[PDB]
Design a protein around this nucleic acid. Structure first.
Ligand SMILES: O=C(O)CCC(=O)C(=O)O
Ligand SMILES: O=C(O)CCC(=O)C(=O)O
Lengths: 212, 214
DNA sequence: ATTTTTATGTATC
DNA sequence: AGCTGATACATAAAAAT
DNA sequence: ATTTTTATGTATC
DNA sequence: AGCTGATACATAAAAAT
């Protein structure tokens, strides 16, 4: 629905391309827009003064984001950094176009609430991950998400279909790459995952998610 | 505020909807319970937890007053069942509209849709804000970040500073920030020695939130 | 094809 | 290397009866 | 009011 | 006690020119 609903928000709405690594919005940018991710993945990050980054969200296809604009009151400015972790296609409705269309087609409000509901549950899902202690468990919990979100079927299990640098992972699970490398290595030795061409394939993903 | 007013008027009959009172410790919903309701927290704090087979718990959300929760219901397409444990970390008071009453009233009074979207939007941001917390490494920083939230969320003014108005056991904290209670004790002890916080009757009073941040 | 920047592996502490 | 978990045990505070 | 279960302080590695 | 961060350096893969 979301995809269909967002198309009709206007002449119709054209998609925007962003190339891998291009910023969808910067800290400071007025929160005047709501987005729908259609193709690709988007990385929501907090950027500390030191230039260092922490990942808050690796949004999956069909995700509503830029949600701070939906809040009424003093015009708010972005505080996270939205970047195209893959090549991505989104819609970028201005906030006032949206508000209008929620009044005219109340069906869009039901569909919108559902998407925000999934965002809350997906983000909580992530808290569960970080709330582990063992960085091996934290990593595995993270991978089991990425399997659910970006994974395609493989002979033995699911291959996480996106290019994940160990650094990118480290930023997502509150660790450092050398730990992420080391740990991923340990999964490889245990024969729980396998990597070819920077693509992590977890075996029996069902069996790992049972351990929680 | 609107939410509160909006939720009041979602009554079964002509009379408004009554609050439900839950005592400290009583479960608002259990894993398995059909997700057929959306809630508004009014007075208190709700602990959303995941309970592993071993009896062990992880806290996902310590929701603050005026929070919308029970949102798996809002997501239709499948009659899903609850997977988290909603419990009153404090004496709480909520509204509990059935999901079909809500859906109807979003179409009839579109004003409530805007107010609902705002509420769920605040949830997303609040939950991310928590990710930021956990995504630290230093458990002292993680703890402090956690407390600075609780100051924003549950804090009332005191002569010395902001008192986080909720009884927090070190265990409860440990579950919230992915640690253990002996670490939480030890760490909180360190704050006490440094004279950055003080605890009376299980209530943590931060003296200068910005001083802790430093 | 020739750099140069990024990603990964391993060891130590 | 340096936290923090694991394990321990004393003792105080809260809950239950 | 007692008793018992839980919470906290502290130590070790 | 033991993970895991900090630091280090080698080396491979990818991007940029
Ligand atoms: O809305 C923002 O500016 C940040 C939060 C966000 O992008 C989202 O999770 O929807
Ligand atoms: O909606 C659920 O059933 C679990 C998550 C939740 O309660 C919420 O955060 O709204």
């Amino acid at each position: 629905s979301l995809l269909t609903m967002f198309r009709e928000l206007g002449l119709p709405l054209q998609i925007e391309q962003f190339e891998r690594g291009k910023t969808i919005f910067f800290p400071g940018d007025p929160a005047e827009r709501v987005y729908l991710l259609v193709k690709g993945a988007v990385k929501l990050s907090r950027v500390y003064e030191s230039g260092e980054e922490i990942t808050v969200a690796l949004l999956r296809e069909n995700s509503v984001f830029g949600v701070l604009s939906l809040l009424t009151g003093q015009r708010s400015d972005r505080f996270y950094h939205a970047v195209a972790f893959t090549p991505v296609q989104l819609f970028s409705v201005p906030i006032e176009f949206m508000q209008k269309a929620l009044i005219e087609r109340p069906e869009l409000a039901n569909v919108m609430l559902q998407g925000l509901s999934s965002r809350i549950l997906q983000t909580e899902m992530m808290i569960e991950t970080l709330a582990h202690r063992d960085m091996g468990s934290r990593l595995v919990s993270f991978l089991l998400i990425l399997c659910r979100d970006f994974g395609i079927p493989s002979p033995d299990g699911i291959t996480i279909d996106l290019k994940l640098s160990h650094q990118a992972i480290a930023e997502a699970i509150g660790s450092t790459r050398v730990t992420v490398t080391r740990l991923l290595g340990d999964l490889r030795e245990s024969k729980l995952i396998a990597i070819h061409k920077k693509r992590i394939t977890v075996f029996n993903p069902v069996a790992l998610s049972q351990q929680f």
